[PDB]
Design a protein around this ligand. Structure first.
Ligand SMILES: [Ca+2]
Ligand SMILES: [Ca+2]
Ligand SMILES: [Ca+2]
Ligand SMILES: [Ca+2]
Ligand SMILES: [Ca+2]
Ligand SMILES: [Ca+2]
Lengths: 279, 279, 279
């Protein structure tokens, strides 16, 4: 049902694709990592950005595909963070979004996160990745066991029904597998660090506009509610300069693509699919 | 090749996913139901509505995805009712449209229909469903054996090439597996019942505008040609108040979503994926 | 890993679907042809056109899905010719685009091309096809072994970075498996032949506007740079009468659909999915 038990019964197993099945019984294939900290991490999702200029258009499966509309039928986006919809396949996880049943079925304790440059074939994924970390606090069990139930518990990613830090989500300390806080500070915007703290993963942050964002990889949000620039995923509506802040990678191009200025992420991060692993 | 033979050779089998193959030989997995009336029903399709406000937009795979355009290249929609295109996977059949090869390959005698609330995991599908029925007239054999050939025989779902009841499709009497005619009358619009009769499934009805609709689940159409409000699927063009009548669930929101008024379906039906089974 | 070795170890095998795996190990199914010139051709792609009137819209996975935009994030299209993204399934390869891992993994010497009318079930593919040819020059080995590496070598299909014939791609002589140069001259536009020569396949031609097109099936381009009318695929931007020249089948409808006049392809070719095989 996961790569963890595969590592458990069968010790010497290594990285690669394995056959798994949901407990309801449908088969699928998942990329098991078996070397990271005892191994056993199952790849369950990937947040790829095909076009930073396309503001909630085709391919922004994680935020919205029909635009940024505040209508009652639009503010919930695609719910791809909190629904059973699955898409993409394994070896294309670095060229377009990917999500397999293991996202919601497999129960887990910790999540691991990789940043892999787009276009990277499978055999390079671990060595070509620029950032790799994972949590070690077993925080998923009180939250339902996976991110699906984590977004049934606080939060349903709904626009407007919260506020910045007063209503933010959890902030989990991470351990670095590849990369370091200096590199973290080198990949995010310059004005990023003025309101964050490296070394944590943050789930369901609220921006200044009450719009919720799923994930902030690498840093915990401080009292700075300009979170559209360093957190990915989201709902289907953001009102500040709409729709310049829509997409899988919400506003990483505020001041120009990859130019790495006050509000612009480094180019190395604009081309980085964010792999999510369960254990 | 189907779940019927699986039930035949191997008796005691129950609900769940099984491995099947088309006669051309490609493998797939299908959810076999084995308790309904001797069992043996294969799940072959699912008409999910992700956004009732999106009029022939992304996700309306059963009616049209490019809008309601009367141009010569547009009036045929996506033909997903009468083509070999397949999409989605099994356990996501309750969060987005689903269709597997068994739709056109497997020959069958009867169809079964379920209404399952969106977001329902597989293990709940039968018990959480609100409506379940099936035909018992073996009407698919004269029509080619499945719905694909049923839409090669009358009708190619083409706009304009017919009229209401004078050119309507078949009306098959159904037996109720869960639900009853009172509940049926409770789920459809109020002004619905003024022109229909419970207890039948109707295929290829024509609306007042000559636009054809694939399926009317639960009721047979009378001389009332306002069929956009209780029949799903369709072609790529409907001219009355275009495009307020486009989508997988064509006009179930004419007078407000789920408000259950003169032309509005009950909320319980707006969130209901329509599962189709073959036998 | 391909159908070639399946033909090699196991002689008498015939046309049909077989199980293959990438060298990284993920399984898939591919349609192996085993009769063409010793057989062993693996079906790896299919360029289907669902709507000639939709100019770079949903379903034009090979050229662009977000329109014809000259913005820096748009001129590269979807890169589906040169990325690991895969989509569609086998038996639907004649109703919508299709591409499997064998596109980029399998190394090959020659390519075969079929034109199959849309809606054709699998069992008819070979006999219902109108054109079938294949190269016999083993030209893929110097280019990386497949079309993916062929579009890492010249050319990255990028708009503007070339010109017509001075910077065109390779022109490979083909042998005819079904069809002949008279039929070829009968399927393309009338004003087509005034600037081409039958009997070659041409990869990465540049149109008069420096926009690059992936493939010209059946003919080699002469000094005529009006290539938008007989070459398929492309990038995400064409500037002449934008966007009347966008789509999988770029401009085969310049003077009316299927009307077979000066700039219009024959109707038999407008409904023809282009199957690509490796060996
Ligand atoms: Ca994306
Ligand atoms: Ca802000
Ligand atoms: Ca739908
Ligand atoms: Ca009406
Ligand atoms: Ca296409
Ligand atoms: Ca031209």
């Amino acid at each position: 049902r996961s790569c963890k038990e595969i590592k458990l019964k069968t010790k010497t197993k290594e990285d690669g694709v394995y056959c798994l099945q949901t407990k309801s019984g449908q088969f699928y294939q998942a990329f098991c990592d078996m070397n990271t900290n005892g191994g056993g991490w199952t790849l369950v999702a990937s947040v790829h950005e095909n076009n930073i200029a396309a503001k909630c258009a085709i391919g922004d499966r994680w935020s919205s595909q029909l635009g940024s509309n505040p209508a009652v039928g639009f503010v919930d986006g695609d719910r791809s963070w909190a629904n059973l919809n699955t898409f993409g396949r394994v070896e294309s996880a670095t060229d377009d979004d990917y999500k397999n049943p293991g996202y919601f079925d497999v129960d887990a304790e910790d999540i691991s996160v990789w940043h892999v440059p787009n276009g990277t074939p499978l055999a390079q994924w671990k060595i070509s990745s620029i950032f790799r970390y994972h949590t070690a606090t077993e925080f998923l069990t009180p939250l339902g066991g996976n991110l699906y139930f984590l977004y049934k518990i606080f939060y349903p990613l709904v626009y407007g029904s919260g506020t910045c830090p007063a209503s933010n989500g959890p902030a989990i300390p991470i351990v670095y597998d590849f990369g370091n806080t200096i590199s973290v500070a080198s990949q995010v915007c310059p004005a990023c660090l003025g309101g964050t703290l490296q070394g944590y993963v943050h789930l369901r942050v609220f921006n200044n506009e009450r719009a919720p964002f799923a994930l902030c990889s690498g840093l915990r949000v401080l009292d700075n509610c300009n979170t559209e620039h360093y957190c990915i995923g989201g709902a289907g509506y953001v009102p500040e300069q709409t729709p310049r802040q829509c997409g899988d990678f919400s506003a990483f191009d505020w001041s120009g693509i990859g130019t790495h200025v006050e509000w612009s992420a480094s180019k190395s991060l604009l081309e980085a699919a964010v792999f999510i692993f369960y254990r």
